[model samples]
Target: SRSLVISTINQISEDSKEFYFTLDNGKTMFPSNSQAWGGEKFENGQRAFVIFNELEQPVNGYDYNIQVRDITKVLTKEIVTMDDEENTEEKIGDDKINATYMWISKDKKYLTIEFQYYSTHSEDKKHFLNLVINNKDNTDDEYINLEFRHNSERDSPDHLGEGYVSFKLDKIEEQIEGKKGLNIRVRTLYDGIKNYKVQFP
Candidate 1:
């Protein structure tokens, strides 16, 4: 199966901005910029999304940082779907994925993303997630990286695990830094399984 992932950075308010994602199949997910979880979460075979918020107004032409994490579980067959809504409110059965966004400190130089995942049926399952960044202003090049923290083994008992990714931008030359019209792509991979072209703006 193939998946599409898209992302963009948008101004949420005068002091903050948001990174939003919209999957091609209608599934959605984003980062929680709150103090708790700096990134996102996802189950096996489920689409995940991410977005970020800036804690303070960015100086014009100054550098801003961003981070992403892929928490999708690996080696499972259960499919989780997203709820249809006119707004960001997502519902599945009795559970809900809120429209919340995440942020980092003003003086913090680098952005950090944390991802977590789990498997229920297997005593041992291994998963991997990769984060990709594309410079919207510079269409000629892209940066890609991976994050993996655990490798479950039989008799060791499968449990949830977390990993992180971080990056820094010295300066943002594009006028769309905090604008709503900017577009970018973020992708995730699990245990060599790949999902690409998830778009957001």
Candidate 2:
């Protein structure tokens, strides 16, 4: 029923995979999954979120060992991404905007973009998505904030995992173009940064 992050996954022989993880309490422990890894390998590094099945069992001899009837990888509402090969450079004025990554959900509440700022690094919050909610029925382009998602280690080149934004589908029916629905736009400060747009059906 609970969720935990996989910090370390080691294929300890063919018999076991030692999964070292830090619990919600910040302490670390290693749990082994000896059963066959049926679906996909749990090699998503530490960012992988594994949900333990609500069905649980207790080990008779171990203090920290708890048996699960099943475990599965579930996708959260946040965006998932990487640098897409199909992405290419965009030219607006003179800046060659290398728009290389983007990912979104079917509900249209989540959005991720590869925001390269050309070597400006910031740790606090924000990557300036300059997102605007373009409601078809509404005239004014409402400015919205793309809250910081995940951070990548090397940002000087402005690679993938730059930042992401999410919002609730509040006022859904009222904010669309008849039946076409609403779309979003990102016209950031970078002129070379070609404006990105997406319409949700």
Candidate 3:
């Protein structure tokens, strides 16, 4: 975890501390884990740099298990978290934003994704992409550059952008591999500087 806002902290047990964070898009998420929440006490609205690792263990009430390698606080109030700097909402014609699709470029630098929702009551009520991956034969470390693309205009034919928010990767997928999903890194389209790895699509 690069930088984030602590939305809520719940001590499920003595050492298991569940932390809920607010993303750039106003989304609150708790890292899925099999291990109990283990870390120091955090406060609401606090920003910090955290060492996050993808550990496939299941914790109670959480779907995936991510271990916090280590977490440190960011005292400066000016530093903006990736969870706070994501792009704004875009509308195509009159339809509201909603969809659940993503495409990776051949090189894997640019990723095209579409997101939409049927309803939103609060953070707990939002939707999540569940990618349960397992491959015993392959253990190669996979890297994906996730440059999200924002689209405009109503392309009524293919409809890749019709009433949707999408991201476009720089390269296309040339070869195929068998294993876990992508650990895509989000970055800028032009500058190409990496922000962080958010998920596997």
Q: What lDDT does each candidate get?
A: 0.28, 0.35, 0.35
TM-score of 1: 0.22
lDDT of 2 at 142: 44
Q: What is the full ranking by TM-score, best candidate first? A: 2, 3, 1
Candidate 3 at residue 105, lDDT?
33
Model 2 vs. true fold: TM? 0.31
For candidate 2, give the lDDT of residue 33: 54
| Model 2 regions lying over 4 Å from their true place | 1-104, 122-130, 133-161, 171-173, 177-183, 188-195
- 1 or 3: which has the higher TM-score? 3
Q: Candidate 1 lDDT, tens digit per residue, 133-163?
A: 3211432233211111222222232454444
Candidate 3 TM-score versus the reference: 0.25
- The 10-residue segment of model 2 with minimum total lDDT is 86-95
TM-score of each: 0.22, 0.31, 0.25
Error of 1 at 83 (Å): 36
Q: RMSDs, each prediction?
A: 18.2, 14.7, 16.7
